């Protein structure tokens, strides 16, 4: 699946995770 | 360059269709380097996360989760 995918190559938004982290403290 | 700025780049690389469920994705992902996380903080997760295309001026401008 589409999503899926594009998610896994574009190296799982990892920094779109560290924002999150950043804000949720 | 700054993380912010990394994440509109990757998120900009998703197609405006997968954007939302990526970011839901992320969130779940986040988790996996913080273990136990409440029920309040996992939904302000998902709260920033749905900032996230609004900040970066990406279609679609919020996700609903
Ligand atoms: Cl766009």
Same mark, same amino acid.
């Given at each position: 699946?589409?999503?899926?995918?594009?998610?896994?190559?574009?190296?799982?938004?990892?920094?779109?995770?560290?924002?999150?982290?950043?804000?949720?403290? | 360059?700054?993380?912010? =700025?990394?994440?509109?780049?990757?998120? #900009?690389? @998703?197609?405006? %269709?997968? *954007?939302?469920?990526?970011? *839901? =994705?992320? @969130?779940?992902?986040?988790? =996996?380097?913080? $273990?136990?996380? $409440?029920?309040?903080? @996992? $939904?302000?997760?998902? *709260?920033?996360?749905? #900032? +996230?295309?609004? +900040?970066?001026?990406?279609?679609?401008? #919020?996700?609903? %989760?």
């Amino acid at each position: 699946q589409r999503c899926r995918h594009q998610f896994q190559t574009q190296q799982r938004l990892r920094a779109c995770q560290r924002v999150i982290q950043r804000w949720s403290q | 360059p700054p993380t912010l =700025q990394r994440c509109c780049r990757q998120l #900009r690389n @998703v197609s405006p %269709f997968c *954007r939302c469920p990526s970011l *839901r =994705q992320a @969130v779940q992902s986040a988790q =996996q380097q913080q $273990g136990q996380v $409440g029920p309040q903080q @996992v $939904g302000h997760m998902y *709260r920033v996360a749905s #900032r +996230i295309p609004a +900040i970066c001026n990406l279609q679609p401008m #919020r996700c609903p %989760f």
